[PDB]
Amino acid sequence: QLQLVESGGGLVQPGGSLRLSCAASGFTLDQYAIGWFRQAPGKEREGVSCISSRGGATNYAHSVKGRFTISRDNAKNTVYLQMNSLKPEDTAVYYCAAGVYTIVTGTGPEDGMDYWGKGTLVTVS
Amino acid sequence: FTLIELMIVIAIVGILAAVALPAYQDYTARAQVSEAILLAEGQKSAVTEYYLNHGEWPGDNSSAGVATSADIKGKYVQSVTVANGVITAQMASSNVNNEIKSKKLSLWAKRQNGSVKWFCGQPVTRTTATATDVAAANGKTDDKINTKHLPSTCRDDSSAS
Ligand SMILES: *[C@@H]1O[C@H](C)[C@@H](NC(=O)[C@H](O)CO)[C@H](O)[C@H]1NC(C)=O
Ligand SMILES: *OP(=O)(O)OC[C@H](O)CO
């Protein structure tokens, strides 16, 4: 079945940059909306960004607005998330999901996703 | 008459000249917000057509069929945005009334078995494109138009159905 694999995790000093990638193998991601979720240690999971199927609708969270950028490619089934101006408060576990387009600043952001990924760990010194 | 009567007359003249006034700023704010209501009413057709022909509400202005948010502006309105079938209009940050400086109002619709009902009032947000329920806009912001600066018809709660 459809499986999501993330990559690009690591450790970056404050004020640096990092790039993630959520891609699927053997399946095409064209009728699904890709969204990124973050879970802090000891805190509930929240949303970060989401992109539409055709890559024309984007929305970010209040804390990450202006520093994060989401892009989508259709020739290769992969979605990129660019991180700029990292802060110590952004250290958490990052997930990628596929499903219906969602607004990351509403009640129950996870109600519109039917597929999930293992997740990657990102630490800011 | 005598001099005491003239002094009393002068005092009454001063009292009349130093009288208070009611709150006309609320009425002016309502008149200005009417423009935003009219501007936001014009985007209903595209959203309704997209919902009818695709089965889900548009997620942004790009596939709603309208221009950019910063381009839909008026003398007192600076931006109109569409998000999950919800239209939100924002006031200007200067050269407007003090009470309605940089505040938002929203319009949204709910589908029935034989009609489509439209609601107007304080800002709301829709999570998923296929949802039929709405909630309050945000809990960490103060950009809400007060009740006193809205028409009696444009006062609806997020629980209305
Ligand atoms: C128009 O808006 C739609 C809601 C959006 N749809 C999706 O994100 C998913 O297909 C829902 O399952 C479209 O992608 C938007 N079209 C664009 C941006 O070109
Ligand atoms: O994104 P939108 O078209 O709503 O415009 C945003 C504006 O730059 C200030 O919010």
mmCIF file of C-alpha atoms and ligand atoms in Angstrom:
data_model
loop_
_atom_site.group_PDB
_atom_site.id
_atom_site.type_symbol
_atom_site.label_atom_id
_atom_site.label_comp_id
_atom_site.label_asym_id
_atom_site.label_seq_id
_atom_site.Cartn_x
_atom_site.Cartn_y
_atom_site.Cartn_z
ATOM 1 C CA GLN A 1 0.000 0.000 0.000
ATOM 2 C CA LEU A 2 0.932 3.682 0.055
ATOM 3 C CA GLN A 3 3.847 4.464 2.374
ATOM 4 C CA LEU A 4 5.429 7.812 3.248
ATOM 5 C CA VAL A 5 9.154 8.140 3.995
ATOM 6 C CA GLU A 6 10.752 11.318 5.348
ATOM 7 C CA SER A 7 14.367 12.439 5.109
ATOM 8 C CA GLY A 8 16.638 15.377 5.850
ATOM 9 C CA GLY A 9 16.717 15.286 9.643
ATOM 10 C CA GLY A 10 19.739 16.275 11.670
ATOM 11 C CA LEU A 11 21.198 18.934 13.949
ATOM 12 C CA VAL A 12 21.493 22.575 12.858
ATOM 13 C CA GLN A 13 22.869 25.490 14.863
ATOM 14 C CA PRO A 14 20.503 28.404 15.600
ATOM 15 C CA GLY A 15 20.103 30.824 12.718
ATOM 16 C CA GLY A 16 20.782 28.108 10.134
ATOM 17 C CA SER A 17 18.605 26.295 7.628
ATOM 18 C CA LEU A 18 17.330 22.803 6.868
ATOM 19 C CA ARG A 19 15.332 21.084 4.127
ATOM 20 C CA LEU A 20 12.994 18.099 4.475
ATOM 21 C CA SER A 21 11.441 15.761 1.920
ATOM 22 C CA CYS A 22 8.360 13.525 2.139
ATOM 23 C CA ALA A 23 8.167 11.116 -0.801
ATOM 24 C CA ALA A 24 6.328 7.913 -1.679
ATOM 25 C CA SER A 25 7.639 4.878 -3.558
ATOM 26 C CA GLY A 26 5.623 3.087 -6.226
ATOM 27 C CA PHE A 27 2.617 5.422 -5.972
ATOM 28 C CA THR A 28 1.681 8.830 -7.357
ATOM 29 C CA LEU A 29 0.761 11.723 -5.049
ATOM 30 C CA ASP A 30 -1.426 13.919 -7.259
ATOM 31 C CA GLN A 31 -4.965 13.635 -5.822
ATOM 32 C CA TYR A 32 -3.823 14.129 -2.208
ATOM 33 C CA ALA A 33 -2.861 17.154 -0.122
ATOM 34 C CA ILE A 34 0.463 16.876 1.719
ATOM 35 C CA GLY A 35 0.703 18.314 5.216
ATOM 36 C CA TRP A 36 3.453 18.565 7.807
ATOM 37 C CA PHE A 37 2.918 17.977 11.526
ATOM 38 C CA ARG A 38 5.202 18.551 14.508
ATOM 39 C CA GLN A 39 5.123 16.982 17.980
ATOM 40 C CA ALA A 40 7.246 18.470 20.758
ATOM 41 C CA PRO A 41 8.617 16.234 23.545
ATOM 42 C CA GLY A 42 5.905 16.040 26.177
ATOM 43 C CA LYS A 43 3.448 18.103 24.110
ATOM 44 C CA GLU A 44 0.545 17.288 21.821
ATOM 45 C CA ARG A 45 0.971 17.077 18.059
ATOM 46 C CA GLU A 46 0.254 20.225 16.045
ATOM 47 C CA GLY A 47 0.304 21.377 12.434
ATOM 48 C CA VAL A 48 2.939 23.344 10.545
ATOM 49 C CA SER A 49 2.066 23.685 6.856
ATOM 50 C CA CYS A 50 -0.133 22.199 4.144
ATOM 51 C CA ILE A 51 -0.157 22.290 0.343
ATOM 52 C CA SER A 52 -2.926 21.603 -2.162
ATOM 53 C CA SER A 53 -2.998 18.890 -4.821
ATOM 54 C CA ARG A 54 -2.000 21.247 -7.656
ATOM 55 C CA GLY A 55 0.377 23.375 -5.570
ATOM 56 C CA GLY A 56 -1.505 26.663 -5.591
ATOM 57 C CA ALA A 57 -2.908 26.824 -2.055
ATOM 58 C CA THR A 58 -0.546 27.149 0.915
ATOM 59 C CA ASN A 59 -1.063 27.936 4.593
ATOM 60 C CA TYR A 60 1.284 27.979 7.587
ATOM 61 C CA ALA A 61 0.995 28.192 11.359
ATOM 62 C CA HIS A 62 1.158 31.423 13.343
ATOM 63 C CA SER A 63 4.591 30.740 14.851
ATOM 64 C CA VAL A 64 6.223 29.501 11.622
ATOM 65 C CA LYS A 65 4.773 32.102 9.240
ATOM 66 C CA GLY A 66 7.446 34.014 7.340
ATOM 67 C CA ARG A 67 10.247 31.524 8.051
ATOM 68 C CA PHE A 68 9.014 28.277 6.446
ATOM 69 C CA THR A 69 8.321 27.566 2.782
ATOM 70 C CA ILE A 70 6.523 24.594 1.217
ATOM 71 C CA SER A 71 6.927 23.497 -2.405
ATOM 72 C CA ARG A 72 5.504 20.663 -4.496
ATOM 73 C CA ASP A 73 6.813 18.824 -7.556
ATOM 74 C CA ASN A 74 4.600 16.715 -9.815
ATOM 75 C CA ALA A 75 7.168 15.123 -12.141
ATOM 76 C CA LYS A 76 8.716 13.446 -9.083
ATOM 77 C CA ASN A 77 6.396 12.400 -6.247
ATOM 78 C CA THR A 78 8.071 14.472 -3.543
ATOM 79 C CA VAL A 79 7.191 17.486 -1.394
ATOM 80 C CA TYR A 80 9.833 19.851 -0.013
ATOM 81 C CA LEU A 81 9.686 21.936 3.165
ATOM 82 C CA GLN A 82 12.343 24.631 3.596
ATOM 83 C CA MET A 83 13.220 25.806 7.110
ATOM 84 C CA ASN A 84 14.883 29.174 7.731
ATOM 85 C CA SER A 85 15.874 31.072 10.886
ATOM 86 C CA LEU A 86 15.706 28.095 13.228
ATOM 87 C CA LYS A 87 15.039 28.588 16.940
ATOM 88 C CA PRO A 88 15.504 26.333 19.985
ATOM 89 C CA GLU A 89 11.712 26.152 20.392
ATOM 90 C CA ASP A 90 11.384 24.363 17.025
ATOM 91 C CA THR A 91 13.064 21.142 18.205
ATOM 92 C CA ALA A 92 10.485 18.368 17.787
ATOM 93 C CA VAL A 93 9.529 15.323 15.711
ATOM 94 C CA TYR A 94 8.305 16.063 12.183
ATOM 95 C CA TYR A 95 5.670 14.030 10.336
ATOM 96 C CA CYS A 96 4.193 14.122 6.838
ATOM 97 C CA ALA A 97 0.655 13.075 5.929
ATOM 98 C CA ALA A 98 -1.514 12.812 2.821
ATOM 99 C CA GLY A 99 -5.236 13.461 2.540
ATOM 100 C CA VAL A 100 -7.790 16.258 2.262
ATOM 101 C CA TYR A 101 -6.697 19.900 2.268
ATOM 102 C CA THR A 102 -6.658 21.262 5.821
ATOM 103 C CA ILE A 103 -6.114 24.564 7.616
ATOM 104 C CA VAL A 104 -3.403 24.167 10.264
ATOM 105 C CA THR A 105 -5.055 26.717 12.576
ATOM 106 C CA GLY A 106 -8.354 24.951 13.241
ATOM 107 C CA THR A 107 -9.916 22.411 15.563
ATOM 108 C CA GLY A 108 -8.796 18.843 14.916
ATOM 109 C CA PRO A 109 -6.286 19.247 12.079
ATOM 110 C CA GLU A 110 -5.729 15.465 11.942
ATOM 111 C CA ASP A 111 -9.340 14.641 11.003
ATOM 112 C CA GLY A 112 -8.654 15.052 7.268
ATOM 113 C CA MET A 113 -5.647 12.727 6.870
ATOM 114 C CA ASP A 114 -5.800 8.991 6.170
ATOM 115 C CA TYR A 115 -2.081 8.227 5.679
ATOM 116 C CA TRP A 116 0.863 8.846 7.993
ATOM 117 C CA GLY A 117 4.636 8.517 8.110
ATOM 118 C CA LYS A 118 7.149 7.198 10.620
ATOM 119 C CA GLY A 119 8.643 10.622 11.311
ATOM 120 C CA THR A 120 12.087 12.171 11.688
ATOM 121 C CA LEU A 121 13.887 13.823 14.600
ATOM 122 C CA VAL A 122 15.268 17.369 14.343
ATOM 123 C CA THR A 123 17.275 18.976 17.154
ATOM 124 C CA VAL A 124 18.331 22.626 17.420
ATOM 125 C CA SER A 125 21.303 23.290 19.699
ATOM 126 C CA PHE B 1 -35.243 91.533 35.436
ATOM 127 C CA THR B 2 -31.986 92.155 37.308
ATOM 128 C CA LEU B 3 -28.307 91.243 37.037
ATOM 129 C CA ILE B 4 -28.813 87.845 38.702
ATOM 130 C CA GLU B 5 -31.108 86.764 35.867
ATOM 131 C CA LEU B 6 -28.494 87.796 33.293
ATOM 132 C CA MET B 7 -25.793 85.854 35.147
ATOM 133 C CA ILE B 8 -28.049 82.783 35.244
ATOM 134 C CA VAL B 9 -28.686 83.199 31.508
ATOM 135 C CA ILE B 10 -24.937 83.316 30.827
ATOM 136 C CA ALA B 11 -24.413 80.209 32.969
ATOM 137 C CA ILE B 12 -27.151 78.345 31.081
ATOM 138 C CA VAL B 13 -25.577 79.415 27.779
ATOM 139 C CA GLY B 14 -22.263 77.970 28.944
ATOM 140 C CA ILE B 15 -23.974 74.761 30.070
ATOM 141 C CA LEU B 16 -25.567 74.364 26.637
ATOM 142 C CA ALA B 17 -22.275 75.151 24.887
ATOM 143 C CA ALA B 18 -20.445 72.516 26.981
ATOM 144 C CA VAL B 19 -22.883 69.625 26.499
ATOM 145 C CA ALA B 20 -21.984 66.013 25.730
ATOM 146 C CA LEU B 21 -22.711 63.987 22.598
ATOM 147 C CA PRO B 22 -23.827 60.402 21.917
ATOM 148 C CA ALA B 23 -21.601 57.765 20.290
ATOM 149 C CA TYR B 24 -21.747 58.559 16.579
ATOM 150 C CA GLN B 25 -18.477 56.674 16.047
ATOM 151 C CA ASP B 26 -20.381 53.376 16.182
ATOM 152 C CA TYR B 27 -22.731 54.543 13.419
ATOM 153 C CA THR B 28 -19.801 55.730 11.297
ATOM 154 C CA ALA B 29 -18.094 52.370 11.862
ATOM 155 C CA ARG B 30 -21.244 50.559 10.723
ATOM 156 C CA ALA B 31 -21.387 52.731 7.602
ATOM 157 C CA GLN B 32 -17.750 51.917 6.825
ATOM 158 C CA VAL B 33 -18.181 48.178 7.506
ATOM 159 C CA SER B 34 -21.072 48.163 5.025
ATOM 160 C CA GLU B 35 -18.458 48.649 2.290
ATOM 161 C CA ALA B 36 -16.552 45.547 3.408
ATOM 162 C CA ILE B 37 -19.801 43.567 3.514
ATOM 163 C CA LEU B 38 -20.599 44.647 -0.048
ATOM 164 C CA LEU B 39 -17.076 43.797 -1.227
ATOM 165 C CA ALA B 40 -17.160 40.339 0.372
ATOM 166 C CA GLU B 41 -20.630 39.616 -1.039
ATOM 167 C CA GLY B 42 -19.194 39.595 -4.574
ATOM 168 C CA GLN B 43 -17.125 36.415 -4.170
ATOM 169 C CA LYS B 44 -20.112 34.148 -3.448
ATOM 170 C CA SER B 45 -20.694 33.128 -7.072
ATOM 171 C CA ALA B 46 -17.251 31.634 -7.722
ATOM 172 C CA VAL B 47 -17.150 29.725 -4.422
ATOM 173 C CA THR B 48 -20.655 28.337 -4.930
ATOM 174 C CA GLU B 49 -19.892 27.311 -8.519
ATOM 175 C CA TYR B 50 -16.684 25.542 -7.485
ATOM 176 C CA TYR B 51 -18.468 23.708 -4.667
ATOM 177 C CA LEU B 52 -21.290 22.639 -6.987
ATOM 178 C CA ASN B 53 -19.006 21.460 -9.797
ATOM 179 C CA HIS B 54 -16.289 19.804 -7.669
ATOM 180 C CA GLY B 55 -17.890 18.607 -4.416
ATOM 181 C CA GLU B 56 -15.581 20.532 -2.073
ATOM 182 C CA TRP B 57 -14.985 24.143 -1.098
ATOM 183 C CA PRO B 58 -12.029 26.044 -2.593
ATOM 184 C CA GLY B 59 -8.982 26.273 -0.371
ATOM 185 C CA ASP B 60 -7.562 29.573 -1.619
ATOM 186 C CA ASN B 61 -8.177 32.423 -4.048
ATOM 187 C CA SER B 62 -6.084 30.624 -6.675
ATOM 188 C CA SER B 63 -8.572 27.829 -7.364
ATOM 189 C CA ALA B 64 -11.602 29.778 -6.185
ATOM 190 C CA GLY B 65 -11.409 31.805 -9.402
ATOM 191 C CA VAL B 66 -10.701 35.242 -7.926
ATOM 192 C CA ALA B 67 -7.790 37.650 -7.646
ATOM 193 C CA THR B 68 -5.182 37.947 -4.907
ATOM 194 C CA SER B 69 -6.146 39.051 -1.402
ATOM 195 C CA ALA B 70 -4.105 42.266 -1.561
ATOM 196 C CA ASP B 71 -5.793 43.253 -4.847
ATOM 197 C CA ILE B 72 -9.412 43.222 -3.585
ATOM 198 C CA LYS B 73 -9.235 46.555 -1.765
ATOM 199 C CA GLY B 74 -11.418 49.617 -1.329
ATOM 200 C CA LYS B 75 -11.398 52.970 0.447
ATOM 201 C CA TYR B 76 -11.711 51.257 3.845
ATOM 202 C CA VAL B 77 -10.901 47.599 3.023
ATOM 203 C CA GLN B 78 -7.333 46.378 2.537
ATOM 204 C CA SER B 79 -7.727 42.648 1.817
ATOM 205 C CA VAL B 80 -10.338 39.953 1.179
ATOM 206 C CA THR B 81 -9.328 36.302 1.537
ATOM 207 C CA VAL B 82 -10.967 32.942 0.821
ATOM 208 C CA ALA B 83 -10.057 29.898 2.919
ATOM 209 C CA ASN B 84 -12.009 26.615 2.777
ATOM 210 C CA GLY B 85 -15.077 28.381 1.406
ATOM 211 C CA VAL B 86 -14.965 31.155 4.032
ATOM 212 C CA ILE B 87 -14.612 34.798 2.968
ATOM 213 C CA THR B 88 -12.848 37.168 5.371
ATOM 214 C CA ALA B 89 -12.390 40.918 4.881
ATOM 215 C CA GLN B 90 -9.935 43.116 6.790
ATOM 216 C CA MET B 91 -10.035 46.849 7.488
ATOM 217 C CA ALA B 92 -7.315 49.371 6.719
ATOM 218 C CA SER B 93 -4.701 50.227 9.338
ATOM 219 C CA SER B 94 -4.862 54.011 8.847
ATOM 220 C CA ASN B 95 -7.160 56.822 7.697
ATOM 221 C CA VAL B 96 -10.193 54.934 9.044
ATOM 222 C CA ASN B 97 -12.302 54.957 12.194
ATOM 223 C CA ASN B 98 -10.404 54.242 15.400
ATOM 224 C CA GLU B 99 -12.748 51.493 16.608
ATOM 225 C CA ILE B 100 -12.540 49.342 13.462
ATOM 226 C CA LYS B 101 -8.810 49.684 12.802
ATOM 227 C CA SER B 102 -7.436 46.393 11.420
ATOM 228 C CA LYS B 103 -10.377 44.120 12.234
ATOM 229 C CA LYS B 104 -11.966 41.213 10.385
ATOM 230 C CA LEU B 105 -15.457 39.984 9.524
ATOM 231 C CA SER B 106 -16.447 36.730 7.849
ATOM 232 C CA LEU B 107 -19.057 35.121 5.600
ATOM 233 C CA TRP B 108 -19.742 31.394 5.295
ATOM 234 C CA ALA B 109 -22.366 29.015 3.929
ATOM 235 C CA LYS B 110 -23.888 25.707 5.024
ATOM 236 C CA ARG B 111 -25.455 23.179 2.658
ATOM 237 C CA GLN B 112 -28.996 21.917 3.272
ATOM 238 C CA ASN B 113 -31.061 19.210 1.592
ATOM 239 C CA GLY B 114 -32.857 21.718 -0.638
ATOM 240 C CA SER B 115 -31.085 25.059 -0.263
ATOM 241 C CA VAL B 116 -27.793 26.756 0.590
ATOM 242 C CA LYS B 117 -27.933 29.148 3.547
ATOM 243 C CA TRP B 118 -25.475 32.019 3.984
ATOM 244 C CA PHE B 119 -24.349 33.526 7.290
ATOM 245 C CA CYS B 120 -22.529 36.744 8.172
ATOM 246 C CA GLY B 121 -20.809 37.780 11.383
ATOM 247 C CA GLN B 122 -17.626 37.404 13.387
ATOM 248 C CA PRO B 123 -14.617 35.549 11.928
ATOM 249 C CA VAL B 124 -14.764 31.752 11.647
ATOM 250 C CA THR B 125 -12.541 29.045 10.174
ATOM 251 C CA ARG B 126 -13.173 25.715 8.437
ATOM 252 C CA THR B 127 -10.633 22.946 8.982
ATOM 253 C CA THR B 128 -11.207 20.527 6.093
ATOM 254 C CA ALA B 129 -12.556 21.208 2.616
ATOM 255 C CA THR B 130 -15.297 18.577 3.070
ATOM 256 C CA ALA B 131 -16.432 19.638 6.554
ATOM 257 C CA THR B 132 -19.933 20.935 7.267
ATOM 258 C CA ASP B 133 -19.122 22.633 10.596
ATOM 259 C CA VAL B 134 -17.287 25.813 11.585
ATOM 260 C CA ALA B 135 -15.771 27.108 14.817
ATOM 261 C CA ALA B 136 -14.283 30.320 16.190
ATOM 262 C CA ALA B 137 -11.451 31.887 14.215
ATOM 263 C CA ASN B 138 -8.572 32.015 16.706
ATOM 264 C CA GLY B 139 -7.946 32.027 20.439
ATOM 265 C CA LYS B 140 -4.656 33.968 20.299
ATOM 266 C CA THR B 141 -5.764 37.114 18.467
ATOM 267 C CA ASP B 142 -7.909 40.209 18.994
ATOM 268 C CA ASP B 143 -8.798 40.998 15.356
ATOM 269 C CA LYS B 144 -12.560 40.677 15.772
ATOM 270 C CA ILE B 145 -15.110 43.316 14.810
ATOM 271 C CA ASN B 146 -17.158 44.234 17.864
ATOM 272 C CA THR B 147 -20.891 43.568 17.964
ATOM 273 C CA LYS B 148 -21.682 47.288 18.240
ATOM 274 C CA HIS B 149 -20.037 47.962 14.848
ATOM 275 C CA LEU B 150 -22.119 45.445 12.867
ATOM 276 C CA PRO B 151 -25.682 45.516 11.524
ATOM 277 C CA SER B 152 -28.287 43.586 13.485
ATOM 278 C CA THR B 153 -28.644 41.116 10.602
ATOM 279 C CA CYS B 154 -24.876 40.472 10.389
ATOM 280 C CA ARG B 155 -24.543 39.018 13.904
ATOM 281 C CA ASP B 156 -24.314 35.221 13.748
ATOM 282 C CA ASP B 157 -22.577 32.685 15.972
ATOM 283 C CA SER B 158 -20.376 29.814 14.826
ATOM 284 C CA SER B 159 -23.015 27.364 16.115
ATOM 285 C CA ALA B 160 -25.777 28.682 13.839
ATOM 286 C CA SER B 161 -27.357 26.132 11.511
HETATM 287 C C1 LIG C 1 -8.452 24.545 -5.551
HETATM 288 O O1 LIG C 1 -8.948 24.284 -4.235
HETATM 289 C C2 LIG C 1 -9.140 22.899 -3.947
HETATM 290 C C3 LIG C 1 -9.782 22.751 -2.574
HETATM 291 C C4 LIG C 1 -7.800 22.181 -3.980
HETATM 292 N N1 LIG C 1 -7.977 20.758 -3.773
HETATM 293 C C5 LIG C 1 -7.126 20.055 -3.033
HETATM 294 O O2 LIG C 1 -6.242 20.573 -2.371
HETATM 295 C C6 LIG C 1 -7.293 18.565 -3.038
HETATM 296 O O3 LIG C 1 -7.451 18.111 -4.386
HETATM 297 C C7 LIG C 1 -8.527 18.183 -2.234
HETATM 298 O O4 LIG C 1 -8.657 16.757 -2.218
HETATM 299 C C8 LIG C 1 -7.132 22.406 -5.324
HETATM 300 O O5 LIG C 1 -5.803 21.873 -5.289
HETATM 301 C C9 LIG C 1 -7.072 23.882 -5.693
HETATM 302 N N2 LIG C 1 -6.528 23.922 -7.040
HETATM 303 C C10 LIG C 1 -5.388 24.541 -7.337
HETATM 304 C C11 LIG C 1 -4.655 25.160 -6.185
HETATM 305 O O6 LIG C 1 -4.966 24.604 -8.479
HETATM 306 O O1 LIG C 2 -3.077 36.433 1.507
HETATM 307 P P1 LIG C 2 -4.017 37.602 1.348
HETATM 308 O O2 LIG C 2 -4.488 37.683 -0.082
HETATM 309 O O3 LIG C 2 -5.202 37.431 2.265
HETATM 310 O O4 LIG C 2 -3.262 38.965 1.750
HETATM 311 C C1 LIG C 2 -2.463 39.027 2.910
HETATM 312 C C2 LIG C 2 -1.991 40.461 3.121
HETATM 313 O O5 LIG C 2 -0.685 40.606 2.613
HETATM 314 C C3 LIG C 2 -1.997 40.796 4.609
HETATM 315 O O6 LIG C 2 -2.682 39.792 5.324
#
